């Protein structure tokens, strides 16, 4: 129960040879997008978002 | 048709396995070593240490590890956090004995080639930069620095001045001082327990028990204002909270979930949340407020986190704090508590549900406890909580001194103790 | 053989002159505007505006200013501080009629062509960097940021995110609102007074009275820390002090000079200072410790500043601070106090003794009231001070809330609250 | 008497197009040299020090 993954809180980075390490908890997002204009920083040698977790033919 | 078989060793290394029937076997090896274990003499060491996993060791070339794991089609990942450093690897079921042979190797006798490490130092800027692509990380891995005198104050990411000067010798020192067998624990999924009894036998020769285990992480009330050109100021009131495994921690959990800490319906205002509604009539829509709770074995943290327009922030964070104060008055409805406890049940079940987060769960729990606790047993404790413990929790959050962090324009945000 | 001819004007412009017979005429213009009058909206504008001195104006091309001032062999200069901003120019006696006309053109009618401003934008980082080559500054600008909620907290140097975003419109908005003629004061020297009655009269046609005049700069107790790899940790801690014109402020000056604000003997260990003689018997010789005293119209600051080995830091500032505590005990002989009063008399007469710093003095106190205060009168004001007033000053320091700023390894430095 | 000369304290920069900003008030300097190691920062696009307003033949 004591793992932070079950709780809202700090991210635990998941560096890997292939897969991107999306994880963690709020730290609000998506809910921030519902109000108008959260423009967010772009292209600081930025990695692509979402990641291809939904692979299909 | 199977439940996990917890087990220890004469060596003291915890081991466990939960047989499944999914084709991808998935084993993980967790260590108690983390970012809180640095002192001032070495810092950002772990941030490199997790990057160094792909490097050549005494038992294998880096080309062999990379091309080998990729040829298998499996993959390795190094999860990391302030309390724990969690190695993990996934593969097809027939491939296990191969990839694990890399796994333990990477953590048993790494050879930190100094030139390779110097080659990986520039990478630290890239990883640290993409990690801060989200401002909230910049806020919290800064807020901890604002809350703690000592151990937990240390950033997960390497400080900019250390990016070019981390040395392999520090890596070795941290490795024999913190990859102790007593600190380690091993978890499997597709792999059966009895074969883990022998494949994990390899590590018994490696590394004796007991590590270093310094520090205590004392609290501090200081602020860290930053002042940037960003319009959407972030903010985070924080007060110390008891954790972990205490019922009081359960009280703070139910406390955050009363306050709408958890996301639910898309494209809709969180009407049941006290904070979103307290702010929605306080200021115009562009905002996002939510409760924040962090669990660490020495001590934990609790407090609101807010995103808001720079002009509106002073109204927003104060409204959100007053919303906590009303609960601190003992004015709390019976129903929202039930809804919150339900949000915790569904939430914890959602966290446990995915196999990878389940592995993080069983392992992170295996380190701190040495006794696996099935989720229903969690449900009796989480149902056990009384309203009075919650009221006392809010009273504790209000009575305590406030740490705070706040990136943004800061043109209107009140200083801690001024709001 | 003449006292300076202080004079006010109907425009509200203040004017003064002090005839000499040194060939270098040297005039100065003092605007009350400073870094403090900046707010969050246009922070860092002053740091560029000081560098805009050579830019083209409505009455002259920039080539004409630079080539003119150089061909004459005279030179313009732009001193600046958190309070006053101070233009100045030096020239031979026969050439003033040219150069002062540039000054009239620089402050009253400075058009800011945007491309020329954009060309100067990158330079701010260079000037800020060479300014940060000096170790004390990097601490003390952070110290003011740690010591004030509001006006005085604003840095003299441009913040890194603002280096490219400063615009000409913000420059104008800062110019009309803060280069008010009522704020201005003009201080000649070798130049004769009546021709100043002429050229100042040329200044009178521009601008109405009273500037925007906001803010108050409230005090605060917050910390700022940097954490670096440098062995030489260096830091300051500061309590509030009444400023100025009070006997109490003189008591803080006499106090810092009891503590030994600075060396009088080159290449010699400071035998008389209590702080050096405390820290020297406390730890190793490599250090430097002395009192610090900021003095601004809204508020003043006082407190020890130190440089030391990172391991020894907590041994140092916990020692020198105790020295102040000894003064709180009333432990203070009359003799060393007389020595300190003599140190202020001699040191003040020295700093005044140069003509340029003299012009800085006259131009500094021309704005607070304008009535010139002859050095002998200042000597009366220090001679007036009693030992009990000094004890009250140290008592206010010990009893007051404290702020701190620090830069170095920071492994051993105490946090501000413990101090 | 607010002047840095009259009351030693924070530096007042003399930064300008025609001259270096060196001046100010203590703020300890030079005295640290008798004690061991006042190493001073090196070549971060550093200007030469002193600024020769004190020219000599």
Coordinates of N, CA and C in Angstrom, one line a residue, chain C residues 48-128:
Chain C
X48 N 19.2 47.7 -18.3 CA 19.4 48.0 -19.7 C 19.4 49.5 -19.8
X49 N 18.6 50.2 -19.1 CA 18.5 51.6 -19.3 C 19.8 52.3 -18.9
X50 N 20.6 51.8 -18.0 CA 21.9 52.3 -17.7 C 22.9 52.1 -18.9
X51 N 22.6 51.0 -19.7 CA 23.4 50.7 -20.9 C 22.9 51.4 -22.1
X52 N 21.8 52.1 -22.0 CA 21.2 52.8 -23.2 C 21.8 54.2 -23.3
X53 N 22.8 54.5 -22.5 CA 23.4 55.9 -22.4 C 24.0 56.3 -23.8
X54 N 24.5 55.4 -24.5 CA 25.2 55.8 -25.8 C 24.3 55.6 -27.0
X55 N 23.0 55.2 -26.8 CA 22.1 55.1 -28.0 C 21.7 56.4 -28.6
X56 N 21.3 56.4 -29.8 CA 20.9 57.6 -30.5 C 19.7 58.2 -29.9
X57 N 19.6 59.6 -30.0 CA 18.5 60.3 -29.4 C 18.0 61.3 -30.4
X58 N 16.9 62.0 -30.0 CA 16.2 62.9 -30.9 C 17.1 64.0 -31.4
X59 N 18.0 64.5 -30.5 CA 18.8 65.6 -30.9 C 20.2 65.2 -31.4
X60 N 20.6 64.0 -31.3 CA 21.9 63.5 -31.7 C 22.0 62.1 -32.0
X61 N 22.7 61.7 -33.1 CA 23.0 60.4 -33.5 C 24.0 59.7 -32.5
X62 N 23.9 58.4 -32.3 CA 24.7 57.7 -31.4 C 26.2 57.9 -31.7
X63 N 26.5 57.9 -33.0 CA 27.8 58.1 -33.5 C 28.3 59.5 -33.1
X64 N 27.4 60.5 -33.0 CA 27.8 61.8 -32.6 C 28.1 61.9 -31.1
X65 N 27.3 61.1 -30.3 CA 27.6 61.0 -28.9 C 28.9 60.4 -28.6
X66 N 29.1 59.2 -29.1 CA 30.4 58.4 -28.8 C 31.6 59.2 -29.4
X67 N 31.6 59.5 -30.6 CA 32.7 60.2 -31.3 C 32.9 61.6 -30.7
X68 N 31.8 62.2 -30.3 CA 32.0 63.6 -29.7 C 32.6 63.5 -28.3
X69 N 32.1 62.6 -27.5 CA 32.6 62.5 -26.1 C 34.1 62.0 -26.1
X70 N 34.4 61.2 -27.1 CA 35.8 60.7 -27.2 C 36.7 61.7 -27.8
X71 N 36.3 62.4 -28.8 CA 37.1 63.4 -29.5 C 37.4 64.6 -28.5
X72 N 36.5 64.9 -27.7 CA 36.7 65.8 -26.6 C 37.7 65.3 -25.6
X73 N 37.8 64.0 -25.5 CA 38.6 63.3 -24.5 C 38.0 63.2 -23.1
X74 N 36.8 63.7 -23.0 CA 36.0 63.6 -21.7 C 35.3 62.2 -21.7
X75 N 34.6 61.9 -20.7 CA 33.9 60.6 -20.7 C 32.6 60.7 -19.8
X76 N 31.5 60.1 -20.4 CA 30.3 59.9 -19.7 C 30.4 58.6 -18.9
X77 N 29.6 58.5 -17.8 CA 29.5 57.3 -17.0 C 28.2 57.2 -16.3
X78 N 27.7 56.0 -16.0 CA 26.4 55.8 -15.5 C 26.4 54.9 -14.2
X79 N 26.5 55.5 -13.1 CA 26.4 54.8 -11.8 C 25.0 54.5 -11.5
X80 N 24.7 53.4 -10.8 CA 23.3 53.0 -10.5 C 23.3 52.2 -9.2
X81 N 22.1 52.3 -8.5 CA 21.9 51.6 -7.2 C 20.5 51.4 -7.0
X82 N 20.1 50.7 -5.9 CA 18.7 50.3 -5.6 C 17.9 51.6 -5.3
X83 N 18.6 52.6 -4.8 CA 17.9 53.9 -4.6 C 18.1 54.8 -5.8
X84 N 19.1 55.6 -5.8 CA 19.4 56.6 -6.9 C 19.9 56.0 -8.1
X85 N 19.7 56.6 -9.3 CA 20.4 56.4 -10.5 C 21.2 57.6 -10.8
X86 N 22.4 57.5 -11.2 CA 23.3 58.6 -11.3 C 24.2 58.7 -12.6
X87 N 23.7 59.5 -13.5 CA 24.5 59.9 -14.7 C 25.6 60.8 -14.2
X88 N 26.7 60.8 -15.0 CA 27.9 61.6 -14.6 C 28.7 61.9 -15.9
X89 N 29.4 63.0 -15.9 CA 30.4 63.2 -17.0 C 31.6 64.0 -16.6
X90 N 32.7 63.6 -17.1 CA 34.0 64.3 -16.8 C 34.5 65.0 -18.1
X91 N 35.1 66.2 -17.9 CA 35.6 66.9 -19.1 C 36.5 68.1 -18.7
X92 N 37.3 68.5 -19.7 CA 38.1 69.7 -19.4 C 37.1 71.0 -19.4
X93 N 37.6 72.0 -18.7 CA 36.7 73.1 -18.4 C 36.2 73.9 -19.6
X94 N 36.9 73.9 -20.7 CA 36.5 74.6 -21.9 C 35.5 73.8 -22.8
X95 N 35.2 72.6 -22.4 CA 34.5 71.7 -23.3 C 33.1 71.3 -22.9
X96 N 32.7 71.8 -21.7 CA 31.5 71.4 -21.1 C 30.3 71.7 -21.9
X97 N 30.4 72.8 -22.7 CA 29.3 73.3 -23.5 C 28.9 72.3 -24.5
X98 N 29.8 71.4 -24.9 CA 29.5 70.3 -25.7 C 28.9 69.2 -24.9
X99 N 29.6 68.6 -23.9 CA 29.3 67.4 -23.3 C 28.0 67.4 -22.5
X100 N 27.8 68.6 -21.9 CA 26.6 68.7 -21.0 C 25.4 68.7 -21.9
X101 N 25.5 69.2 -23.1 CA 24.4 69.1 -24.1 C 24.1 67.7 -24.4
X102 N 25.0 66.8 -24.4 CA 24.7 65.4 -24.6 C 23.9 64.9 -23.4
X103 N 24.3 65.4 -22.2 CA 23.6 64.9 -21.0 C 22.1 65.3 -21.0
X104 N 21.9 66.6 -21.5 CA 20.6 67.1 -21.6 C 19.8 66.3 -22.6
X105 N 20.5 65.7 -23.5 CA 19.9 64.9 -24.6 C 19.7 63.5 -24.1
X106 N 20.5 63.0 -23.2 CA 20.5 61.6 -22.8 C 19.3 61.3 -21.8
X107 N 19.1 62.2 -20.8 CA 18.1 62.0 -19.8 C 16.7 62.5 -20.2
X108 N 16.6 63.6 -20.8 CA 15.3 64.3 -21.1 C 14.7 63.7 -22.4
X109 N 15.4 63.5 -23.4 CA 14.9 63.1 -24.7 C 15.6 61.9 -25.3
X110 N 15.4 60.7 -24.7 CA 16.1 59.5 -25.1 C 15.2 58.6 -25.9
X111 N 15.0 58.8 -27.2 CA 14.2 57.9 -28.0 C 14.9 56.6 -28.1
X112 N 14.2 55.5 -28.0 CA 14.7 54.1 -28.0 C 14.3 53.4 -29.3
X113 N 15.2 53.5 -30.3 CA 14.9 52.8 -31.6 C 15.1 51.3 -31.3
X114 N 14.1 50.5 -31.6 CA 13.9 49.1 -31.1 C 15.0 48.2 -31.5
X115 N 15.5 48.3 -32.8 CA 16.6 47.4 -33.2 C 17.9 47.7 -32.5
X116 N 18.1 48.9 -32.1 CA 19.3 49.3 -31.3 C 19.2 48.7 -29.9
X117 N 18.0 48.6 -29.4 CA 17.8 48.0 -28.1 C 18.0 46.5 -28.2
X118 N 17.4 45.9 -29.2 CA 17.6 44.5 -29.4 C 19.0 44.1 -29.6
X119 N 19.8 45.0 -30.2 CA 21.2 44.8 -30.3 C 21.9 44.7 -29.0
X120 N 21.4 45.5 -28.0 CA 22.0 45.6 -26.7 C 21.4 44.5 -25.8
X121 N 20.4 43.8 -26.2 CA 19.8 42.8 -25.3 C 20.8 41.7 -24.9
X122 N 21.6 41.1 -25.9 CA 22.5 40.0 -25.5 C 23.5 40.4 -24.5
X123 N 24.0 41.7 -24.5 CA 25.1 42.2 -23.7 C 24.8 42.1 -22.2
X124 N 23.5 42.1 -21.8 CA 23.1 42.1 -20.4 C 23.6 40.9 -19.7
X125 N 23.7 39.7 -20.4 CA 24.2 38.5 -19.8 C 25.7 38.6 -19.6
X126 N 26.4 39.3 -20.5 CA 27.8 39.5 -20.3 C 28.1 40.4 -19.1
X127 N 27.4 41.5 -19.0 CA 27.6 42.4 -17.9 C 27.2 41.8 -16.6
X128 N 26.2 41.0 -16.6 CA 25.7 40.3 -15.4 C 26.7 39.3 -15.0

